[PDB]
């Protein structure tokens with residue numbers, strides 16, 4: 001079977017309890033994870049150890065907190081106490097875990113399931129070929145020996161409009177923001193990098209990225225996490241918002257793809 005779980009955010013106990021609920025069995029089953037494996041919850045170290053151990057039985061995409069962890073590890077960004085990342089950063093296998101993490105994809109595609117996954121979704125300004133190319137470009141910089149330079153370049157809120165003519169730092173920054181930070185769009189598809197509210201609470205003319213018809217969403221289902229204030233609700237057919245805010249005292253959600261059946265694990269916090 002195929003299971004898709006939203007942002008874990010260091011909630012290792014909840015993750016294991018949810019996987020035991022569905023009797024997840026590597027070799028029979030595959031797990032998709034929407035990213036943000038780490039930060040806020042208490043068990044980021046255990047989460048990374050376990051997910052890495054799964055190998056081919058897991059399909060991960062990196063989220064904004066995964067990238068921020070990499071930036072802290074590389075000395076690019078400052079450690080925030082509230083992220084609770086010190087046990088992971090101080091672990092004896094930290095190098096092995098984080099060099100594995102930076103090699104993971106930003107985008108997962110299954111053509112037989114007609115299923116696409118990224119942390120924040122697929123901007124309506126991208127067709128599939130462009131999304132693939134952009135993911136490849138950023139994954140290439142992240143898996144290179146020079147990844148700290150890219151992590152430093154990644155921070156920024158502009159440009160917020162895609163163009164095939166984008167080059168250099170602006171191109172990489174847009175790609176990173178689209179895959180890992182996107183929530184709201186302007187009517188022309190341009191990213192808004194400030195509003196994190198629920199769709200009903202946001203200011204006009206902002207709309208969810210998934211409320212703007214895009215070529216990927218017309219042909220593929222899209223699963224994503226990231227947008228906790230959406231509470232996994234209010235999405236169109238074919239759009240699966242899996243982040244129900246476990247680290248926030250909400251729930252961890254698992255979707256079984258074959259029958260679209262949901263399983264939920266309450267937060268222990």
Ligand SMILES: Nc1nc2c(ncn2[C@@H]2O[C@H](COP(=O)(O)OP(=O)(O)O)[C@@H](O)[C@H]2O)c(=O)[nH]1
Pocket residue numbers: 036064065196197198226227228229245248
């Ligand atoms: N207004 C509102 N904000 C929320 C809610 N849940 C989370 N947030 C906020 O959203 C901000 C970004 O958190 P989140 O959506 O989990 O994404 P992440 O930071 O990438 O992991 C956090 O600082 C939370 O305070 C909610 O239910 N309502």
Ligand SMILES: [Mn+2]
Pocket residue numbers: 007009036063065226227243
């Ligand atoms: Mn998150």
Ligand SMILES: [Mn+2]
Pocket residue numbers: 036063064065119180225226227
């Ligand atoms: Mn996120």
